[PDB]
Ligand binder design. Sequence first.
Ligand SMILES: [Cl-]
Length: 129
Amino acid sequence: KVFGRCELAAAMKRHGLDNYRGYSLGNWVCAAKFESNFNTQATNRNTDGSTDYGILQINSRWWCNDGRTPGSRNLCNIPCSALLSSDITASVNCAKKIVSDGNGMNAWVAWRNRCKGTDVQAWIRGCRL
Ligand SMILES: [Cl-]
């Protein structure tokens, strides 16, 4: 599924991401835009052999099991394919674990390079929330 901007904002708000660990809703929408272009089915292979999955590009090296990243962890206790669903619940639940782990949203390279320090509230402007 390819989400619209306000559609995704409202879905993330319902799942408890607004102000989660101090990150306003606009941060999460901005990260999803530049990680996946709002597409739940996005996948990208990394040079180390791991793969990033879903709307928030969650990495198989640490967070999910895809059966092809030897010596990796599965900290969210989920198959990586669950992160490609049109239902974002699994991606949101796993993202909450990631952002709590010490480095905050810096875990997402696109957020660090394209959202951090910008007017992120623009990503939710005009949406009925
Ligand atoms: Cl980047």
